Symmetry: C3
Subunit: 222 residues, 3 copies
């Protein structure tokens, strides 16, 4: 079985080259299902396409990516070592390297997802960004929102999962915990480090911060 | 040396196929040491097995994984781009993608380790979960424990390393800092965002949270 | 184009072997630009070298790494699935696995960067460590500094980027948020979980922590 199915991977790689896809190495490509694509698609080494996948025009997929049952709009750039499962990307999204989209990730036009970021059942609005070290689960995020490094939707209480809704034009400071269910109004700002347990008004700053203090001459243990 | 040792990798890949291992691509497989395996093992592209490794039955290892000196029980699923070194997994553990187990990681039956999670000298009990963006070092974690996204054992003070002990049936809220040495009693709940500096009683909620407030009409700088 | 340029990758791999580089698999190596190297360099599977790259002696590069326009000093160890772009590493740095250095990352002698750590326009001093789940952007970090898991430079306010400066001999507790622009004096200690909004004095402990409390007999929802 193994050698035979490996041969069928060469066939596919070859047919893809003939149909105008740029494969960096046809010997390091795997298609387990069906791929539909537009023009000028570029696929790097060690990519694996699973299930039923569709790529628009000029999509670029970097080394090591795994894309399963997903829809990827024109001009998207998927950077190295990014895993995508049952997600939809609109045109001109940039994700990765080291991004992980679980089923139900919906990215709107121009959205950005950076390194060590995970999405599941979450929509990221147009031009919105989640650049670092973040989990967004069971969330609606509006357009032109900035999701600071370290932000986490607390969506699961051990019994049920609950929905977070963030409005347009929101700035989420780093290391914010969004305790679901919670809604953050359009234009609001969440201070870095905030534990958000209550709805935030439009154009409001939400904060839950102890003033910084200092003790002089502190010796660490030797 | 290089071409010769590459040939010896083909030999191994071939012998593994003959012995009933399912290798997705024998040309993208590396065994640097010895592998013992049960029946129905499936190994994807670009896996590297190092040192002395043993896999039970029906173990599935996804693309890009690196497994060194480890013991992996029956039915485990190791997802893509996961690195495992000197770890033991009981039956039916699921780890990755992008998990990183350092020496001394001990996972008990059915345990789960998600993306961007690191373990070192830490035991994860039966059916317990650490799904996201977490470091567990020098820790004992009991059975049926949930470790929320963003949790970190503070195990090292710049001089020494100290042990964290979490009991059975504990819910660790997201972004908890466990300041070692510390013990959290069976059934307890740690509120999201808590800095745990003192032992937590059985069935207790521990919390260290400033009430959320809000200022109206907050303008961000242009 | 594809098959022809693939052939030129074999040529390069072959020339590199002749020039004394240890390539684990010449069929899984890609050079897109120019590589200069010293003696005893070891390069594992699925590495991609981009732009103009220089490696000192005895550099070891693990599986899946992507290195572009970078300078890597003698004795460095780059662990698996690490992405490096426009960075300089001094001698004896260890980075990865799963590290991500963006342009302007400058690592001084013996520095360490661990899993799920991102640097951009940031200097890491001699013997300094950032082992886990951290973003350092637009930062100066001195020598013999420990950057705890979960630390984040808050460098961007939605309008501008600002600089964080950490002195020599500083201990940054886990999950610290550094709100830029901010300076932390030589020898200081930041308590785990602190939101640093004000400059920290030399040899001072900075802290912003609510005392832990506990409520007895807390039932989670069923
Ligand atoms: C420098 O970047 C920041 C500064 C800052 O306050 C000075 C805050 S904040 O959240 O404390 N905050 C914010 C956030 C955005 C704009 C202005 C301010 C003032 C203040 C209330 C956040 C960041 N950046 C990130 C990514 O968190
Ligand atoms: C919705 O998910 C959560 C809710 C929640 O409080 C309403 C808390 S909590 O930690 O603030 N907390 C918890 C945690 C579990 C169950 C019930 C409560 C009430 C409260 C004291 C935590 C989460 N989830 C995660 C992963 O952190
Ligand atoms: C056990 O490791 C720690 C202990 C600790 O306090 C007991 C603190 S702390 O930041 O709360 N803190 C520190 C930090 C370093 C040395 C001594 C102390 C005492 C106290 C003020 C931090 C860590 N480790 C990490 C990685 O954060």
């Amino acid at each position: 079985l193994s050698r035979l199915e490996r041969v069928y991977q060469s066939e596919q790689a070859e047919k893809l080259l003939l149909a105008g896809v740029m494969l960096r190495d046809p010997a390091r490509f795997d298609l387990r299902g069906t791929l539909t694509h537009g023009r000028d698609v570029e696929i790097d080494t060690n990519v694996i396409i699973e299930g039923n996948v569709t790529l628009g025009h000029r999509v670029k997929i970097g080394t090591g990516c795994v894309i399963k049952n997903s829809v990827i709009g024109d001009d998207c750039e998927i950077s190295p070592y990014t895993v995508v499962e049952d997600a939809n990307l609109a045109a001109a999204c940039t994700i990765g390297p080291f991004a992980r989209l679980r089923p139900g990730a919906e990215l709107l036009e121009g959205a950005h997802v950076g390194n060590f970021v995970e999405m599941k059942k979450a929509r990221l609005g147009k031009g919105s960004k989640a650049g670092h070290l973040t989990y967004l689960g069971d969330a609606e995020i509006g357009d032109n929102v900035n999701i600071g490094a370290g932000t986490i939707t607390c969506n699961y209480d051990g019994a049920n999962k609950f929905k977070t809704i963030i409005g347009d034009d929101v700035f989420v400071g780093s290391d914010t915990q969004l305790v679901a269910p919670v809604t953050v109004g359009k234009g609001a700002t969440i201070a870095a480090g905030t534990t958000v347990t209550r709805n935030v008004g439009e154009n409001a700053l939400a904060i839950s911060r102890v003033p910084q203090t200092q003790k002089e001459g502190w010796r660490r243990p030797v």
